[model samples]
Target: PRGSHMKLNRVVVTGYGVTSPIGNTPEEFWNSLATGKIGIGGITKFDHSDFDVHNAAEIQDFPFDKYFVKKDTNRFDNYSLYALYAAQEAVNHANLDVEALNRDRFGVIVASGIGGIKEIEDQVLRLHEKGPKRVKPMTLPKALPNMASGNVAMRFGANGVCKSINTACSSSNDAIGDAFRSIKFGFQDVMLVGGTEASITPFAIAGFQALTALSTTEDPTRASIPFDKDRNGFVMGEGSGMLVLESLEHAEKRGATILAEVVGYGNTCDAYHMTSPHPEGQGAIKAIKLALEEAEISPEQVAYVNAHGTSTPANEKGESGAIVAVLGKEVPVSSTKSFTGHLLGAAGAVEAIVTIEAMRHNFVPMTAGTSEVSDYIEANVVYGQGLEKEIPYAISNTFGFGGHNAVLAFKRWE
Candidate 1:
């Protein structure tokens, strides 16, 4: 799908909030990046001694009580809670007057790759061990992927279009792109869109382990070495990222803060393989061109790219080749997963936030967790400390297992 460049209202990002392995707040997240912080650690959420990969970027010391009431917490899964928490933070950051807003003209769209897998995993185990009668009735409601968007809608009382997208890793990018289209097409004035995932459970980890999609390195510092010659595989992570978006006229009418402008979107599928990207990066190149074309900007104008570099050998090389093919090797590229790990469905939304913030600060964060670049890579990959540069326009890319590709283009707020 391509974006509607003309005959549509302009969309702007008013605010953004995220709960990542590196930081929970925007300021804190920036601090971590400024200091080259890495979030990988030994898996502590579960006993993974039997598994090959013993490390992940898990959210540690989160205070669920701070965002959810006792009753709400009991009813919702961690994925929903994470969405609500990030949404709340984004709303506060945007200074949105929910009471004054038209409920029918607002919407919420949050996504999760695995949804409440932990809940389902736990219940299935309980049923196998205990019996059929031991299964709780709330399991269905809590484990469904749509619960996250449903709860976010209920939280804000936004009576507009709410959707849950599950396109593997690109879920959030597609969700955000849809939200942008909704506002651009006059379907709504405002939208809350993002992605979340809490799938670092026994079953989820074991599943990825079987596929060899995760890094087996025990050292947290070197586990997620994106673009490095010695890189192995991606490290699983869990978190959420929410963005408050509105038509430029709507945001201006309400005197809301403008963080960035959503200029273009592109969504496509490789349709080539299940787990391996096309050796030539066919779909990936087209997806990048789609976004750039819709933005009406030449590839040479793109300042930087937030790549879907999962640290996997095949993915890094394939994606890098795609970037070079379209934008050339002069364009800067970095994978925030080097620090936050792979958040699966939430990776796109969170990395979009990272791209926007990097533009705001006029810098590009170095690939944290990686000290050296592979001789195979040809892109201008940043490492060590982040680079100070002019990023007038930036793009974020997210690819999924089903060969799904989604890209979003954003311009620095001017």
Candidate 2:
């Protein structure tokens, strides 16, 4: 009730880029995880002396200029800047022609969970301790949540409706779903849609520590083990995920090679809890069912599911229940977050990428560190390493802190 509900739209993802704890590009992220690599490491961003948790999933060297020119980046937060970097990569990947496409009909939707916490906290401290002039003129605009979407639109010169969604972790996933509906309803022909997150800030870490929802393990290998018996909690992670989406007609007309089809997107709220999921995953149940309905497919038709699996006690259990409720025990499911850590807002996009790529790779990448399997959901979970299996249809689901549940269904292009 407190959050904004979005309407559905038709959308297509033409391009994408991600700079996350796992890797910068999709190739890197996949390689790191595919080879049993872990992104959880010692905290180097700041002094973790005062914090209860020390380790975080932080990207050490994401060069902003690699995605965009240096001149245009100075006015944005690391959050906005990260979004721009992915957006730039997405636009270039799409090889979109601004002249050929209707500029007035194209739009942008970008989002982040913890938007500009670093800049806001720093500027607030400076303004109180120093003076108003010390507040940094760029801080206000750069730190605002809407700036990422605005800046992304400016970079691509997208003149249609530009908006941002901020529903915590599920924010941008919902944003992509909204953009999908926009295209379907004739509101926009093409949409650059996705989300970015840079909440690897001091404030974010501290807050997660307060909730004790973070991994306190000193070993990166043992930090995030979803569906495992000894699983503790999720590790803090950050990154930006961008996707260029267009209608099927628009894509085919441009001779675009379609990688996968975005057939269904469904989102629902628990209306039950803040940080935890419904005990029986009732909300997640509705979401996945809605997605299947939209895609015009039966649950038995689904081959693989990239789970939200945050490695926390609540999510794993909820997802287990959800999977059993929908697809029973025969479905092969894997949680990539066990390898990438939780990217919050960016989690959905990166997971979506992994899902699409799974169709390409012919195997669902292992859920790293999930050695000890869960007896509770053994039938649904792809635990105890990975497997090379058949998958005709794949679904990626993300549930956020505010009880937002989102599902994106991807199927192999026929």
Candidate 3:
């Protein structure tokens, strides 16, 4: 009797925004993907002259002043700034009047892998160099991971379920999935969900370098060659992606233009390694199966898959194994990371945008920079140029460090 009043709701994406290395807006981002555009270049955030890693996908010439005042820019960390900017863009795209909406039912869930690393590094250095008296007072608020979600909630007066997820590279996927569930379970009517990351600081780069997870290639074009035998490691990338999701009923009532429908989400963990994915992709296989099951579709119904191909050797091997095992070797698959480099926690959200665009445009983006696919990777890895295809259903896969695997299934809202 307690559950009788509740009814299931369908979730639909109304609008999305992105601040990626290739583009700052959704239209620009989609164009770059349609044409093979590589955004990796020499790291300019800091002097990487002595480090083995030379290239990074940094957000260049961001118009911060356009969105925030001078004081706001200084007060918020780059990660939060990126999130706020993208969130505003998403709201504007959705054409949702925040003041008119029931603010109590609006929510925000943003994800970041390493929150405010630049702020942490700067403050820690200041403390060591000039004592505690010189350290900035805003360091704590600026360095916390939840500030991305917290700031967005404050900006839009979203008083509903505000949360931040950090499942490493899979953070945004999990966030999106959780938001989808929140709406599906009739807990919320609208949700703003995605991820932002600005971890390209010198100290962060050095930490990743220590883990041997960064590409040392000097050539930007060859840096992030996902699924290619020549790929050494992933090139670091920074940016943010935000999407506005609303219950189908709410969106229809508001006459919102639906972009796509979130049909299913699957989150799983390998629990087999700290940094490496399961060798046979056991976790990934299960996650994909679960998502397909929830969507009530067979593997053959999927048109394309946006892989979590980080260009790392282990990731390609494990992820490809799972794809081939589940969807067979002929399913069209590609890794957009080859173009934008690895965005870490922001990867899933950005790739989800790409996937949805692919469905809307009837295209599949190529895995840029990968000239030749690895022999062991049996899946049909799209490369060279983009492909024209009718994508009725698509899957976006994001696996993170600590064996976190998040998979999302989306259907074209025709």
Report, for all candidates in order, the number of backbone clashes: 0, 13, 0
**Tens-digit per-residue lDDT, 129-177, candidate 1:** 9999999888988999998898899889999998999999999999999
TM-score of each: 0.97, 0.94, 0.98
Top-scoring candidate (lDDT): 3
Q: How far out, in Å, is residue 97 in model 3?
A: 0.9
lDDT of 2 at 394: 83
lDDT (10s digit) by residue, model 3, range 339-392: 888888888889999999999999999999998888887889999888898999
Clashes of 2: 13
RMSD of 3: 1.0
> In candidate 2, what are the lDDT values of residues 1-414, reduced to their tens digit?
744655544445666777787787778877886787878888888888888777788888787657556665458778887787777777777788777888988899987777788888889899999999778878878788888889888887899989988777788778888887788766788888888888877888888888888878777788888888888889888888888888888888898766677888899999999888887789999999998999889999998999989988778888888988898888888888887788887788778888887887888788888887777764467656567877788899998898999998877875
Off by over 4 Å in 3: 4-6
Candidate 2 Cα misplacement greater than 4 A, ranges: 1-11, 68-73
Candidate with best TM-score: 3
Return the lDDT, model 3, position 366: 94
